[PDB]
mmCIF file of C-alpha atoms and ligand atoms in Angstrom:
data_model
loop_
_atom_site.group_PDB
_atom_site.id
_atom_site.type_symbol
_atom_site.label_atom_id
_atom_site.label_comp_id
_atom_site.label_asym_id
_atom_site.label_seq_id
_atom_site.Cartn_x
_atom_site.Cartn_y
_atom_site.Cartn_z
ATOM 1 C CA UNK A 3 48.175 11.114 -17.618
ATOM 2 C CA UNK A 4 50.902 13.215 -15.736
ATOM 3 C CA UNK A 5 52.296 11.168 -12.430
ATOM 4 C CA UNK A 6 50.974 12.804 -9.310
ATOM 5 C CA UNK A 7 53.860 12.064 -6.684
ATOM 6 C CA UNK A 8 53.822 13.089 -3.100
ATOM 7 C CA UNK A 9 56.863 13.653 -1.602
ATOM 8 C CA UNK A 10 57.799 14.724 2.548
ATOM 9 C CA UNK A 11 60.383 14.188 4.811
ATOM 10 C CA UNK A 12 59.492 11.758 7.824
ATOM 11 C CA UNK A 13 60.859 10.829 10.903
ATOM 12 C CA UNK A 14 60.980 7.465 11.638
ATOM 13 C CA UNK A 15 59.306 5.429 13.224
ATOM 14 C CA UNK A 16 56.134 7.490 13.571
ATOM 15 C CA UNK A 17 56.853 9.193 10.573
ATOM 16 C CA UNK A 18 56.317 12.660 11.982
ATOM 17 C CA UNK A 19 56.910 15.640 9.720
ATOM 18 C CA UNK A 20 56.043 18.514 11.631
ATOM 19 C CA UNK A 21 55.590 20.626 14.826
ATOM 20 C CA UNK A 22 54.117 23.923 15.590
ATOM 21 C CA UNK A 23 53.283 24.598 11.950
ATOM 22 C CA UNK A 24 56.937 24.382 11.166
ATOM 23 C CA UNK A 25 59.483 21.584 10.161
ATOM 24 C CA UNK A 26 61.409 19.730 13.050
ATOM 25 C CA UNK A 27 64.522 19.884 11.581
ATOM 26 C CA UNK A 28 66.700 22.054 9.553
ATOM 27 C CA UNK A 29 68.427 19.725 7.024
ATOM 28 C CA UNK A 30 70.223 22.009 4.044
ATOM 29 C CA UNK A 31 71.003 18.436 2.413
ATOM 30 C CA UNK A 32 67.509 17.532 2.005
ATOM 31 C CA UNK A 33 65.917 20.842 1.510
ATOM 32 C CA UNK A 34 68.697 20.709 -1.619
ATOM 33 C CA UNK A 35 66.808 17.407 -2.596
ATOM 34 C CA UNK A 36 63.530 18.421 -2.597
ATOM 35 C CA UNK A 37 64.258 21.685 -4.705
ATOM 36 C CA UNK A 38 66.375 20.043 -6.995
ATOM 37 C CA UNK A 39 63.800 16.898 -7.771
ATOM 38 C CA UNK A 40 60.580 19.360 -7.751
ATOM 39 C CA UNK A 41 62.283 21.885 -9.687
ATOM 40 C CA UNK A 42 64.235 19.565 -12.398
ATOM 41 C CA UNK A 43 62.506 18.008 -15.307
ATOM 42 C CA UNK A 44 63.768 15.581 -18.338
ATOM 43 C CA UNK A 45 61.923 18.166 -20.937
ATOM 44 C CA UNK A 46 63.485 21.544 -20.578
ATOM 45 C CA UNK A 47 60.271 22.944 -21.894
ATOM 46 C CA UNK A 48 58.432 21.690 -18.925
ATOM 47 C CA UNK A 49 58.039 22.575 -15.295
ATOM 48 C CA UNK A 50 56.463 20.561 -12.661
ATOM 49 C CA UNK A 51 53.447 21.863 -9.938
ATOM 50 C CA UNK A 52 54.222 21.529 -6.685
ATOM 51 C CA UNK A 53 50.679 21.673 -4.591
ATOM 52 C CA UNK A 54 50.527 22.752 -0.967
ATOM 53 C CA UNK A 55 47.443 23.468 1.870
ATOM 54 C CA UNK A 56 46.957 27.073 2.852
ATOM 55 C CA UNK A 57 49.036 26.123 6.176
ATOM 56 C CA UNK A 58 52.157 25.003 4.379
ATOM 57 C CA UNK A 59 51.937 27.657 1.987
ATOM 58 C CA UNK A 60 52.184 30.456 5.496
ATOM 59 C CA UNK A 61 54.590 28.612 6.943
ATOM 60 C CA UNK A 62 57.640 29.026 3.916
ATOM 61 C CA UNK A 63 59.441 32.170 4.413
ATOM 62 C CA UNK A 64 58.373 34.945 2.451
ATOM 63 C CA UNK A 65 61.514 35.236 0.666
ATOM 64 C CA UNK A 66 61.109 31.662 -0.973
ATOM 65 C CA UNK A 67 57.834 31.792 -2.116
ATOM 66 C CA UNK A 68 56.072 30.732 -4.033
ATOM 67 C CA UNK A 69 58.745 28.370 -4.987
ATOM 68 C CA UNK A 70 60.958 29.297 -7.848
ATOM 69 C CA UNK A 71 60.687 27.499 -11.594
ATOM 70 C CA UNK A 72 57.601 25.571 -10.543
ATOM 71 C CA UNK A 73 53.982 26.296 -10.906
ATOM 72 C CA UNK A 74 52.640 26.791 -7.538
ATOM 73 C CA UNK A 75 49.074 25.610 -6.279
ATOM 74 C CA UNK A 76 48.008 26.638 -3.118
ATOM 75 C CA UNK A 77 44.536 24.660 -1.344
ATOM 76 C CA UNK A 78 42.044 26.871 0.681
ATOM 77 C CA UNK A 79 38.558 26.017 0.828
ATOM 78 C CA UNK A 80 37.846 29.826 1.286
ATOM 79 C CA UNK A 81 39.371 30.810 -2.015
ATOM 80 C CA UNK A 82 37.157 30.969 -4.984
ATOM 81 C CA UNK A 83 36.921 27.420 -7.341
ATOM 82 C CA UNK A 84 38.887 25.017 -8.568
ATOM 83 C CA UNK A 85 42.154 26.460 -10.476
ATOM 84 C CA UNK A 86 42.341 30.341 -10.276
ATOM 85 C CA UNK A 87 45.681 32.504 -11.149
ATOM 86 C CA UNK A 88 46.187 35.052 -8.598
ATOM 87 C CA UNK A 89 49.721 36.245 -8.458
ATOM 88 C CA UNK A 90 52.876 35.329 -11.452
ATOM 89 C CA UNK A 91 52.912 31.591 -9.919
ATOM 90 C CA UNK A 92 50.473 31.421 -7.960
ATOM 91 C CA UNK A 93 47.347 29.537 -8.887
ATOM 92 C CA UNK A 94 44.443 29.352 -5.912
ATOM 93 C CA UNK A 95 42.218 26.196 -5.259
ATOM 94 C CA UNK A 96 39.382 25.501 -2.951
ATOM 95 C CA UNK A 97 40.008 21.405 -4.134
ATOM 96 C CA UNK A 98 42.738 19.376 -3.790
ATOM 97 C CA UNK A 99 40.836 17.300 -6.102
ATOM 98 C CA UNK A 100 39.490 19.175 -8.555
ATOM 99 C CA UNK A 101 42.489 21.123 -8.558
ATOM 100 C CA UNK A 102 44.226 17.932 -10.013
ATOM 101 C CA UNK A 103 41.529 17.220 -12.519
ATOM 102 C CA UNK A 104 41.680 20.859 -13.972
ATOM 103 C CA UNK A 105 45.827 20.380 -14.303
ATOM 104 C CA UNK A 106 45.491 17.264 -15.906
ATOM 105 C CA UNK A 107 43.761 18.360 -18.683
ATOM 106 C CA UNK A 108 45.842 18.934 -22.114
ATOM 107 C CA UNK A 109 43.391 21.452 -23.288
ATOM 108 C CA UNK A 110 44.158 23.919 -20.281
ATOM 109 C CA UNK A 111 48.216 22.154 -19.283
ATOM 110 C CA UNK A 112 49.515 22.245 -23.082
ATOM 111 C CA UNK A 113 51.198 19.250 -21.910
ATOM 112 C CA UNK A 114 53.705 21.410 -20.804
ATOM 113 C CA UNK A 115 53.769 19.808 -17.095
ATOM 114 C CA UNK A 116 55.575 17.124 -16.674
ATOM 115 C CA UNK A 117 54.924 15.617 -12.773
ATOM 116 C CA UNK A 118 52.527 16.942 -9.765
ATOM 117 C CA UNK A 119 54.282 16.748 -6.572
ATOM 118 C CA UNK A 120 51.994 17.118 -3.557
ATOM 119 C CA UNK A 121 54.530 19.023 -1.353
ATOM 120 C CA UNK A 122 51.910 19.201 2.227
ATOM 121 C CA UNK A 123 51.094 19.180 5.062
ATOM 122 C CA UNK A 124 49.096 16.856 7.004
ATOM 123 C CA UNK A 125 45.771 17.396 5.700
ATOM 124 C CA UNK A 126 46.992 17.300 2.182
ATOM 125 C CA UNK A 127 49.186 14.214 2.624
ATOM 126 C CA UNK A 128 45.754 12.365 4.416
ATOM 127 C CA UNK A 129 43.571 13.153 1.417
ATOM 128 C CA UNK A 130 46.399 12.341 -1.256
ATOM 129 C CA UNK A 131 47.115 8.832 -0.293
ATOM 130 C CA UNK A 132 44.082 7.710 -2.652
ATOM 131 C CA UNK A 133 44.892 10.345 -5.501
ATOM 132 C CA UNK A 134 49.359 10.043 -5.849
ATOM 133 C CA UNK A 135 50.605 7.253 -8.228
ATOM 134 C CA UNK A 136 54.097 7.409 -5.798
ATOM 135 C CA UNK A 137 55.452 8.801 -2.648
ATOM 136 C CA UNK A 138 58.864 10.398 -2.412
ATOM 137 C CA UNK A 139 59.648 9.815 1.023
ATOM 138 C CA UNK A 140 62.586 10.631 2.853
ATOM 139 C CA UNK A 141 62.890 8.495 6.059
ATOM 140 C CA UNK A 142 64.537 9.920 8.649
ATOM 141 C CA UNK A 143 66.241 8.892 11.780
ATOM 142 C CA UNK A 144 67.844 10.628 14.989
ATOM 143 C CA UNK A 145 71.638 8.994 15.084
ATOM 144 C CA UNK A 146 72.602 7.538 18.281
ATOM 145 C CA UNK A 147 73.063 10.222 20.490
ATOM 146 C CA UNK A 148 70.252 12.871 18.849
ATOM 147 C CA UNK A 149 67.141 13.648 20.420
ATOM 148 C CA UNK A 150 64.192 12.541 18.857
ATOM 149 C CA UNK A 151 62.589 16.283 18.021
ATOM 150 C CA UNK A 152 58.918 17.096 19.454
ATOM 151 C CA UNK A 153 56.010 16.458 16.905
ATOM 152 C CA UNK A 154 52.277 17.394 16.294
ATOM 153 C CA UNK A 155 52.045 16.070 12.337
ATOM 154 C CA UNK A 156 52.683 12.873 11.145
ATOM 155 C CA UNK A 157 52.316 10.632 8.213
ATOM 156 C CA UNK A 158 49.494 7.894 7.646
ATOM 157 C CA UNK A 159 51.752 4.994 7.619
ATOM 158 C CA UNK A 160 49.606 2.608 7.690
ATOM 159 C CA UNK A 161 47.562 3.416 4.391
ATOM 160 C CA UNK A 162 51.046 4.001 2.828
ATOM 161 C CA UNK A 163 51.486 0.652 3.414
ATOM 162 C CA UNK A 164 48.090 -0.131 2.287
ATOM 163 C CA UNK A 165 48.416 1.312 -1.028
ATOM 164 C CA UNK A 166 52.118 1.135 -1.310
ATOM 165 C CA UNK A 167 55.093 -1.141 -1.895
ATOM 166 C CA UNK A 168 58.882 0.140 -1.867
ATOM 167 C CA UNK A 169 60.030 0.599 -4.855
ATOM 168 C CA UNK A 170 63.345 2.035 -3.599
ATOM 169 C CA UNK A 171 65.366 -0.117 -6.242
ATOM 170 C CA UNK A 172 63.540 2.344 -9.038
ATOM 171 C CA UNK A 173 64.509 5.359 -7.396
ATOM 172 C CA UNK A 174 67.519 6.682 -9.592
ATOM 173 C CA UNK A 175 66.142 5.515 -12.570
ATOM 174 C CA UNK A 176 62.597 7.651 -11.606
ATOM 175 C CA UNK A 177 64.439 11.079 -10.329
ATOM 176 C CA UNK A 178 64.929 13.366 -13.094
ATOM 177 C CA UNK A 179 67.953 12.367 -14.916
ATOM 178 C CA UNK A 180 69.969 15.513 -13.915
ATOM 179 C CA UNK A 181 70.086 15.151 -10.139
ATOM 180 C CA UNK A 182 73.324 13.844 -8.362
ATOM 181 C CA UNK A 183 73.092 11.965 -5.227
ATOM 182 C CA UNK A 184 76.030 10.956 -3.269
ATOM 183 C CA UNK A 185 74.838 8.014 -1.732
ATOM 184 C CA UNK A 186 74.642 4.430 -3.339
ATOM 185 C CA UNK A 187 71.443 2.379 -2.658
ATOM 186 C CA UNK A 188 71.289 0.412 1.337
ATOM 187 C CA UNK A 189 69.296 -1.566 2.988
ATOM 188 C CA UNK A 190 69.803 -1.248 6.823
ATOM 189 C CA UNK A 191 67.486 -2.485 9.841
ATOM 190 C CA UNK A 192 66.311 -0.094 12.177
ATOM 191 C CA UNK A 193 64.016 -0.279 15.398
ATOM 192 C CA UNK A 194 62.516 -3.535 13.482
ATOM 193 C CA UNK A 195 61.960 -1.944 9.947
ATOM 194 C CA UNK A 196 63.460 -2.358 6.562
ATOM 195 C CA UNK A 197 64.858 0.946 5.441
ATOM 196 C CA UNK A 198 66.082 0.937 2.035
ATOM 197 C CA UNK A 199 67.070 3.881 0.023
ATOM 198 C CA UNK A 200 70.323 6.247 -0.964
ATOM 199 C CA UNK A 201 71.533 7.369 2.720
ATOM 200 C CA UNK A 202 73.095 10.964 3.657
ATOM 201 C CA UNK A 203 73.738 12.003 7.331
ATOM 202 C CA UNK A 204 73.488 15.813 8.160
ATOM 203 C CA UNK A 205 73.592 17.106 11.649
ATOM 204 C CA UNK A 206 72.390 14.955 14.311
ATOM 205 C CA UNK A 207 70.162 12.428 11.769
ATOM 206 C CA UNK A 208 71.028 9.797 9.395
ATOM 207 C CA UNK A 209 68.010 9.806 6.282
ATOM 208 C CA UNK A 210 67.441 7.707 3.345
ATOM 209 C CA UNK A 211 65.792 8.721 -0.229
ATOM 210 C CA UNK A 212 63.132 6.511 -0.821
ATOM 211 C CA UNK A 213 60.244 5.614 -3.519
ATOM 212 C CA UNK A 214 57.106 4.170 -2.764
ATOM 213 C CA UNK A 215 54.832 2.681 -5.453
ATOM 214 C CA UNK A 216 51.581 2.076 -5.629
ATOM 215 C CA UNK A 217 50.689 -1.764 -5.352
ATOM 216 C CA UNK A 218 49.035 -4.132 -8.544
ATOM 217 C CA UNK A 219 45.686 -3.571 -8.695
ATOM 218 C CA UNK A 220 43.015 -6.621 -9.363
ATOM 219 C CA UNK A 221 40.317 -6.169 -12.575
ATOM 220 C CA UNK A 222 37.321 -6.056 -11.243
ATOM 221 C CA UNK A 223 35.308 -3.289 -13.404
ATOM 222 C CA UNK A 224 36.291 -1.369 -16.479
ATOM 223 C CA UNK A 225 33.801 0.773 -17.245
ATOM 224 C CA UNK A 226 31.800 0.299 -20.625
ATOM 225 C CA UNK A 227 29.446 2.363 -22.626
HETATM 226 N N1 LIG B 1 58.109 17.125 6.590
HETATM 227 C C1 LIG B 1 57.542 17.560 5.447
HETATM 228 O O1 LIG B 1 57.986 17.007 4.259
HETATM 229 C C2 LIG B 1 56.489 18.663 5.409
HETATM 230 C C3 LIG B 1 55.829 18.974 6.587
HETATM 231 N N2 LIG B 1 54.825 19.889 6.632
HETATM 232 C C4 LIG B 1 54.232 20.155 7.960
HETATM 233 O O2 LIG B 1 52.833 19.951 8.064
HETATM 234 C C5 LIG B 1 52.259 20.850 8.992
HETATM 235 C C6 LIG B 1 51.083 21.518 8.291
HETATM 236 O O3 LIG B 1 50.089 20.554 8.006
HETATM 237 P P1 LIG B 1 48.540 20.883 8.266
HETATM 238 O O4 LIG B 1 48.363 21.771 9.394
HETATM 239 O O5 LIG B 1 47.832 19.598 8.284
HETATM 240 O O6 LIG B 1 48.209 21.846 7.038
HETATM 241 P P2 LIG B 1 48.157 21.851 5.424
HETATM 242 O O7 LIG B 1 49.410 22.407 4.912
HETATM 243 O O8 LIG B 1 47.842 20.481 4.990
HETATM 244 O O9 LIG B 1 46.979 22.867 5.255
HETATM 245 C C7 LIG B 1 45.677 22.512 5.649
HETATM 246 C C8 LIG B 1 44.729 23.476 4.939
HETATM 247 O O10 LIG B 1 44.617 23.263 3.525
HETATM 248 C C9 LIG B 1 43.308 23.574 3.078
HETATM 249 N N3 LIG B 1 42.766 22.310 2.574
HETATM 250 C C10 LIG B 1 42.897 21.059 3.103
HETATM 251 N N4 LIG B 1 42.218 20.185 2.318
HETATM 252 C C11 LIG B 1 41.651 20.859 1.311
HETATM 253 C C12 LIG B 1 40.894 20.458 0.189
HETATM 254 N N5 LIG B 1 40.528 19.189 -0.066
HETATM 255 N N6 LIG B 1 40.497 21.447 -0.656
HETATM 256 C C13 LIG B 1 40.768 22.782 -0.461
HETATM 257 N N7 LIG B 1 41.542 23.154 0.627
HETATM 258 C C14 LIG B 1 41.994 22.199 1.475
HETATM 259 C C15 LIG B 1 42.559 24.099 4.297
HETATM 260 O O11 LIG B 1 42.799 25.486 4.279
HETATM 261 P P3 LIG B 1 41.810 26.572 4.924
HETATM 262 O O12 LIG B 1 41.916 26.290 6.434
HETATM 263 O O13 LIG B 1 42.352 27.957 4.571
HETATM 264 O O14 LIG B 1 40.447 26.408 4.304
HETATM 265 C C16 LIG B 1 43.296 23.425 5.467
HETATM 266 O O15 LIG B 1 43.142 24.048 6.744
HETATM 267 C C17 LIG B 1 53.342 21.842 9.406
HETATM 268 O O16 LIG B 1 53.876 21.375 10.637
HETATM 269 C C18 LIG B 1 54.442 21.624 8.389
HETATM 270 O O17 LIG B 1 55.739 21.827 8.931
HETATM 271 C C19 LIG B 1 54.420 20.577 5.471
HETATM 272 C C20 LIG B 1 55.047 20.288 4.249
HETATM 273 C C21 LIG B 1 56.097 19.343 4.203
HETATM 274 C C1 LIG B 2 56.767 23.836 7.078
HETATM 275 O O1 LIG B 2 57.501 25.057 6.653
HETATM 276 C C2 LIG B 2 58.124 24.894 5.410
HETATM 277 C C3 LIG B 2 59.252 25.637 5.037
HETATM 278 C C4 LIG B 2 59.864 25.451 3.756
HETATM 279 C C5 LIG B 2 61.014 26.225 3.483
HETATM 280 C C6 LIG B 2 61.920 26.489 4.551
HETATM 281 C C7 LIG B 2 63.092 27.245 4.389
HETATM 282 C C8 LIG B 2 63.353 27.742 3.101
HETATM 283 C C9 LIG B 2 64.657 28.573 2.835
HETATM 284 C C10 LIG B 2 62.463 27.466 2.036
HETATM 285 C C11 LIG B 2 61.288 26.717 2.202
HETATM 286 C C12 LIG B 2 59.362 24.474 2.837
HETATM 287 C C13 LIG B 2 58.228 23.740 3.240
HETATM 288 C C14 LIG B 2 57.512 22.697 2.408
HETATM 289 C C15 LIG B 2 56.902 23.287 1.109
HETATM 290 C C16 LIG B 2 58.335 21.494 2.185
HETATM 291 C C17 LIG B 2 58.884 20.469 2.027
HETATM 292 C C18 LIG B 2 59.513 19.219 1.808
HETATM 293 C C19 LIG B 2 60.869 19.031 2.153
HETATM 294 C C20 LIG B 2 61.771 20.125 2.833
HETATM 295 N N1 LIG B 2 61.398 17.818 1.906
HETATM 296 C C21 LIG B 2 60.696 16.809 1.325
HETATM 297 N N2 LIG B 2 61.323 15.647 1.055
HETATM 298 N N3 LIG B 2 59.434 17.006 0.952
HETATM 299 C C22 LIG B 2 58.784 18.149 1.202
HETATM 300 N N4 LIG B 2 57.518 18.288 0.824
HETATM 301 C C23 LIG B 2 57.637 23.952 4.489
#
């Protein structure tokens, strides 16, 4: 009942998003993005959840976290069951899964949430392609004379693709109606791919904002009592 949306940066074409436990790049412009779309909601008396693994969770500086104006789940199948408060923010989870279910329910959520973004890593993003209803991802790609950073964590493109069409033409219209973005919507070739999206550049990379939505679905059960 409330949209479950992952949402990453990725480096094209592998769509790597990480290295050493930490991000590859430093990108103020798209950091600003993330905040502003995870953060920002069309009810004011909402907030959105923004769920992480234990990993991702140790790897944001101390100062930021847990991340400001949103509910904040962290996943660790050593903490104690399935959607615990532990700190003013923080909510603990051993399941990503039933994690979600427990949110989801009116009785516990007021409906008070409006959208679950499924902020990482890895792990997370592996087990999520079956439970999001969209992907925000922003593609990235090293300009001309960058070099392509090191990375250890990557994307499952392929089930993306899978699961997912582009629905990049929706993206304004699905972003919360208060964010700006300076770009206007582009579709550009690169290394054999369609990338289409709302471009910035920022140091040595050129990225696009993208949506991904997940693909018509055939009948073939409804369940009946
Ligand atoms: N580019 C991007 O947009 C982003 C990139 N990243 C990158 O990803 C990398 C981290 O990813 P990764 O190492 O895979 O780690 P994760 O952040 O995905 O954390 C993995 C941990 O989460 C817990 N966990 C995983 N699945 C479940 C589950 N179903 N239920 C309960 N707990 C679960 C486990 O914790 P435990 O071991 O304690 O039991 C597991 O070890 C870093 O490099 C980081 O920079 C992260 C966020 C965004
Ligand atoms: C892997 O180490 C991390 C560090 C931070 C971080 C770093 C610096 C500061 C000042 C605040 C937070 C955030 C993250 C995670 C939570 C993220 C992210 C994410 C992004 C930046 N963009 C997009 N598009 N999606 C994301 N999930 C990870």
């Amino acid at each position: 009942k409330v949209p479950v949306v992952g949402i990453v940066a990725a480096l094209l074409p592998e769509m790597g998003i990480g290295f050493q436990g930490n991000l590859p790049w430093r990108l103020a412009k798209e950091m600003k993005y993330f905040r502003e779309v995870t953060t920002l909601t069309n009810d004011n008396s909402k907030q959105n959840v923004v769920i992480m693994g234990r990993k991702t969770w140790e790897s944001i500086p101390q100062k930021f976290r847990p991340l400001p104006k949103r509910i904040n789940v962290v996943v660790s199948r050593s903490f104690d069951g399935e959607l615990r408060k532990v700190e003013d923010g923080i909510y603990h989870s051993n399941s990503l899964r039933n994690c979600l279910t427990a949110l989801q329910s009116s009785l516990a959520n007021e409906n008070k949430i409006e959208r679950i973004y499924i902020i990482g890593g890895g792990e997370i993003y592996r087990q999520s392609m079956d439970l999001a209803d969209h992907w925000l991802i922003t593609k990235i790609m090293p300009l001309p004379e960058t070099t392509i950073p090191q990375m250890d964590t990557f994307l499952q493109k392929q089930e993306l693709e899978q699961r997912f069409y582009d629905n990049s033409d929706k993206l304004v219209d699905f972003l919360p109606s208060s964010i700006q973005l300076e770009g206007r919507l582009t579709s550009q070739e690169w290394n054999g791919e369609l990338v289409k999206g709302l471009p910035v550049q920022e140091k040595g990379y050129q990225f696009y904002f993208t949506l991904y939505t997940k693909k018509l679905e055939h009948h073939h059960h409804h369940h009946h009592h």
